[PDB]
Amino acid sequence: VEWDAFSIPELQNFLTILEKEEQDKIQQVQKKYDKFRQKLEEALRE
Amino acid sequence: SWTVEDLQKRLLALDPMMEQEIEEIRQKYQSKRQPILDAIEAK
């Protein structure tokens, strides 16, 4: 991708898009660990 | 009794593992935004 072909506002928008994708990805991850944790906390509390 | 310790060890492993995945994610996404930042700065 030749990013220089895009205008400043287009490039800014791509950054906003990537920022939103990165947060979503981090959310997926926090959620995955939260489910591991609940199963663990159940076994422990027993 | 081994079990409770092992379970306990896994629980205490979660956040450190999770923070390490997240770090991997941020580096990945920084890598993806870097050539965009460069194009912005080179204009």
Residue numbers in the entry:
A (entry chain B): 2 to 47
B (entry chain A): 9 to 51
Paper text:
The MST-mediated apoptosis pathway is controlled by its interaction with RASSF family proteins and the WW45 protein. We also elucidated the MST2 homodimeric structure and performed structural and biophysical comparisons of the homodimeric and heterodimeric interactions.
The crystal structure of the SARAH complex, consisting of the MST1 (residues 432–480) and RASSF5 (residues 366–418) SARAH domains, was determined by SAD from a single SeMet-derivatized crystal at the Se K edge. While the SARAH domain of RASSF5 consists of two helices (h1, residues Glu66–Ser373; h2, residues Ile374–Glu412), that of MST1 has only one helix which corresponds to the h2 helix in the MST1 homodimer structure. Another difference in the MST1 structure between the heterodimer and the homodimer was that there was a significant distortion of the α-helix of the MST1 protomer in the MST1–RASSF5 heterodimer at proline residues Pro453 and Pro472. Moreover, the guanidine of Arg470 of MST1 formed a bifurcated hydrogen bond to the side-chain carbonyl of Glu388 of RASSF5.
